[PDB]
Design a protein around this ligand. Sequence first.
Ligand SMILES: NC(=O)c1ccc[n+]([C@@H]2O[C@H](COP(=O)([O-])OP(=O)(O)OC[C@H]3O[C@@H](n4cnc5c(N)ncnc54)[C@H](OP(=O)(O)O)[C@@H]3O)[C@@H](O)[C@H]2O)c1
Lengths: 354, 351, 174
Amino acid sequence: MKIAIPKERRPGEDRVAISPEVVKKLVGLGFEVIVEQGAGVGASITDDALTAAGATIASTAAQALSQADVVWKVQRPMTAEEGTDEVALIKEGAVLMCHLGALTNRPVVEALTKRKITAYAMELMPAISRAQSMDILSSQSNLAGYRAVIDGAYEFARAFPMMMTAAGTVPPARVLVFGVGVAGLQAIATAKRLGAVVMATDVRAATKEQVESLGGKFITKQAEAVLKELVKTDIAITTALIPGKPAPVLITEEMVTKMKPGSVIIDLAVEAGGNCPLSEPGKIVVKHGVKIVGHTNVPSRVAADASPLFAKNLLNFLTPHVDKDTKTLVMKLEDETVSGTCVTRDGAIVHPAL
Amino acid sequence: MKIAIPKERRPGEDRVAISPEVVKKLVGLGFEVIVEQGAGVGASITDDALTAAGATIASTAAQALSQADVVWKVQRPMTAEEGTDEVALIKEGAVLMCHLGALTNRPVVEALTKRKITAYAMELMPAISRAQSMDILSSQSNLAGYRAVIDGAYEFARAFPMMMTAAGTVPPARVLVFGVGVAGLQAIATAKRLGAVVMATDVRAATKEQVESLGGKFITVKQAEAVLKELVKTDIAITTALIPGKPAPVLITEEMVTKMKPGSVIIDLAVEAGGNCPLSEPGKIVVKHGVKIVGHTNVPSRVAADASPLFAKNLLNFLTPHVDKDTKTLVMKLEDETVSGTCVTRDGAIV
Amino acid sequence: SVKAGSAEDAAFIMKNASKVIIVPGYGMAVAQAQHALREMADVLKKEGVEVSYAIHPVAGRMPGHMNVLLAEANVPYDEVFELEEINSSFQTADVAFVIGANDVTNPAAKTDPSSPIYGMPILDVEKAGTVLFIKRSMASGYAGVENELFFRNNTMMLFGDAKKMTEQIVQAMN
Ligand SMILES: NC(=O)c1ccc[n+]([C@@H]2O[C@H](COP(=O)([O-])OP(=O)(O)OC[C@H]3O[C@@H](n4cnc5c(N)ncnc54)[C@H](OP(=O)(O)O)[C@@H]3O)[C@@H](O)[C@H]2O)c1
């Protein structure tokens, strides 16, 4: 077949849905790999590194997509009503695989449906063991947890680790991670790596284990223990998200009141409403001496690492549906990773969203 | 007796020569502690946090320094033709203690002589074992070493540690630290605790062991070929080689930068002294050959909330020995090698 | 004068202690002996022994030298103290486990003006019942002077590599 990966046109999107390693896997499966010129610049992947891997370079997005049987993209295709009709570049009846944001972006679903594109919403990857290697949310939110701490330390005018010194004892920074997670668990680990005293909370019971496994202090009706820790906290990282519904409010404005000056909040759910009210998307707000960070698209801040993984999730999702040197792709419907993520098909939105 | 601590007025300077802790112990020595309002805001030290320790809060600079017998500042006072005349705000005959850069800033020294101010240049602290707790160079450039890795991490579009996940593995970042003083060692420490593969090199002898006492590899197998071999696979490169009052030695040249991978960065902590990389510009994140040449100015001020207490307690360790009547009168014992080794001017006379 | 010991008889001491205070120095870092040190520690805590780490200001060769290594070895911070905070507790502690540290304990700084360390505050590890020193040989530390604690009735030298010596101890503590 013919497979195409365009550059991401949306503002601030530096990731790309491919890497040189995954190119070599695709050609080996019997694919022609098309990649738009400069798509991997934000992810530190040269066009040279892709040609060397076996891929073909297209000058424009349209060209790359024109003859593409299968299309790999990071974020949803932009419609005509958004200034760049990317949907019109995909060949009719072609397959689409990307982070569609299907449930919160229905006009894009119709646009694709109207072109008879069979689009797979990668974000709905069912919660099973074999499909975690296909899971884009974990893979990417994992980097977000890491980056959430690197952003913490960058805005923090104190040091993370404890340090006994001729000039006195530099105390260890105190981190409180809201919502254990792929993201949350990765925040915990990176913070502890830096030398901070990490604490953590979440509504899920079995949390304690993985938190304590990392050597983090799981907080143990129960809410009053956080307010007692949050006041001692230097870096507060919140990661709690809800599918479709807005983000939970774990840190209110009066909570910020009780925090030390020079004390940071990384609200990773900023885009989904935020876990902190005064956290604003794409900004660093200074409130009550507390810096409230609400960066948009955090996985894009680790583009060079975020991209190659994202590409493997797709590779993992696709591979078992290739025949044996038959040079054909066919997504076995009865497979639940296919069934659960197919949002639209053959000109009809064949999914629970009437 | 009174001691005053102003707000640092130099642009970029967010440290302060005071902390809640050293106020308490200054009051116990018989001092009336006075500070300019908002002087410690840049170091996450609120005005009420000082009065909590026993400090007096003055509204302005001049309305705090005119009355002070001793003055604690982080960094040299500005003169008339430098922006704002702070030297003039100090009381005649008062004692000054801060980072002067005296042997490089003779004009601020003479400006003090005129006003008959006794000044002690904290950076000229003799390197003796007991006086390590007074050394500002060591306390401050240590946090510079920590910051460098944090900045590097920030500028890098990849993660530092190795991460195995459900969908493959990202490799660890490869770090290379040029020159191993206090800063190099702390960088290595932060880099390696972060999860990166840390390499380090230095022209010094007992460095190899010191580097190895952190988990890092000291580059030694046509010598800089071993250096090069590593520098090309490198992702982040931190340079710390600062010659005393001389220009920073060149360690990463243009053609050495061209060899580096696109996405790689260079944190140059020698910028202000010429740079360990001559392709680096002060205060600027330059980009060349797909490589970020980071050259932030005044690095410890980027860790201001932790640098200021260390600076304050440095200043306190130096002063404490010389205060007594039972406890309410300062007399710097010139006998003390720390005093004579650091005094730059006194009673309208250069020393 | 010099009282020497082994890992097998170094374990007879700390097992038969009610309170032990760990004093790590630069030699502990050179040997990368920290994972074994943490391992020796929690063996004792599981046996009821009281354990703590006395981290000295200028221990090692940089600020926080000891800290990052212990931090990496997963030593709890609630067991780590600065000179000022634990220096008096050596009274009650009956054993001082000094791993790779030397100058940091040298009383020449407290009672000898000619000493090049005179005036530097030290950890009072001569107060505890027994004083253990892990050390490859009789060589001096950074200061270049010799340490009086070495030739004392309550002091025993554990000559060897801080890593191996600590592993040997853990294995003798089985
Ligand atoms: N921390 C700082 O910021 C800094 C900066 C400058 C100077 N210093 C100085 O360095 C000293 C540091 O304190 P310290 O307590 O660590 O004293 P130290 O002077 O560093 O003593 C180190 C001891 O460890 C031993 N050692 C070295 N390698 C070893 C190994 N592989 N296994 C077992 N033992 C080993 C050495 O003797 P053997 O080789 O015979 O075993 C030596 O006696 C202080 O005097 C301080 O003034 C510190």
